[PDB]
Write a protein that binds this ligand. Structure first.
Ligand SMILES: Cc1nc(C(=O)NCC(=O)O)c(O)c2ccc(Oc3ccccc3)cc12
Lengths: 11, 235
């Protein structure tokens, strides 16, 4: 899950 | 009483700078801010949907700022990605509540959200928060005697982020060491700052106050498509 929170972290 | 060691000054500076860089509308917030029109956020005769529509509009930029804060801490950045997520779902509400509460204006009886929206206690309660609104508004009313500056608010935010308490953590021990670095540096700063308040035991009670505010994720929780997806991910 958490597909967008994950993206913001590696941004 | 003991004041910051040299490594804690380095620590204080870094955390403080992380906070100023991520606080919405920085120092202009009381000038850019606008009062919600006061027809919005009255007692329904459940939940007012117009108030609710505004709060989902600003929740996502607000969650985002908290993520920008943790990513400016080298301590947070060396955690495994799974741990950073757990840490971030656990403190997001807590940190947003804190930043809204230091922006209490007694001349108006409002907190300011996103640096631009002044909201009264009734509006925030009827927009969905319920009793958690009275909780946050109580924190801001009680914080005005504590006179917290940018670094004290920043170290608060750091203590809440680094919670080995949260379930599912792989690096529980590592997370507990970072928080003790912050906890120590925070006290030493409180000593030097010489507030005229038994400061520090009282501040630790305010940390508990925020964690309670955070622990009401479920006692807060309109169809799920109505929530912004980033909000759904941290609640
Ligand atoms: C508790 C807090 N705070 C802030 C905020 O901006 N804080 C100030 C700042 O971080 O600078 C918000 O924008 C919030 C938005 C919504 C919210 O609940 C709701 C979420 C969805 C629907 C209704 C209310 C709580 C907020």
């Amino acid at each position: 899950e958490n597909a967008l929170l994950r993206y913001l972290l590696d941004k | 009483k003991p004041e910051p060691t040299d490594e804690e000054w380095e620590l204080i500076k870094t955390v403080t700078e992380a906070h100023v860089a991520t606080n919405a509308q920085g120092s202009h917030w009381k000038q850019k801010r606008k009062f919600l029109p006061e027809d919005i956020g009255q007692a329904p005769i459940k939940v007012d949907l117009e108030a609710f529509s505004h709060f989902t509009k600003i929740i996502t930029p607000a969650i985002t700022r908290v993520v920008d804060f943790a990513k400016k801490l080298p301590m947070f950045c060396e955690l495994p990605c799974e741990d950073q997520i757990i840490l971030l779902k656990g403190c997001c509400m807590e940190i947003m509540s804190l930043r809204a509460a230091v922006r209490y204006d007694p001349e108006s009886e409002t907190l300011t959200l996103n640096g631009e929206m002044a909201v009264t206690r009734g509006q925030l309660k009827n927009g969905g928060l319920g009793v958690v609104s009275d909780a946050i508004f109580d924190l801001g009313m009680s914080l005005s005697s504590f006179n917290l500056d940018d670094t004290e608010v920043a170290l608060l935010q750091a203590v809440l982020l680094m919670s080995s308490d949260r379930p599912g953590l792989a690096c529980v021990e590592r997370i507990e060491k970072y928080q003790d670095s912050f906890l120590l540096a925070f006290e030493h700063y409180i000593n030097y700052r010489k507030h005229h308040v038994h400061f520090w035991p009282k501040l630790l009670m305010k940390v508990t106050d925020l964690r309670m505010i955070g622990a009401c994720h479920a006692s807060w929780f309109c169809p799920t498509e109505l929530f912004p997806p980033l909000f759904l991910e941290v609640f």
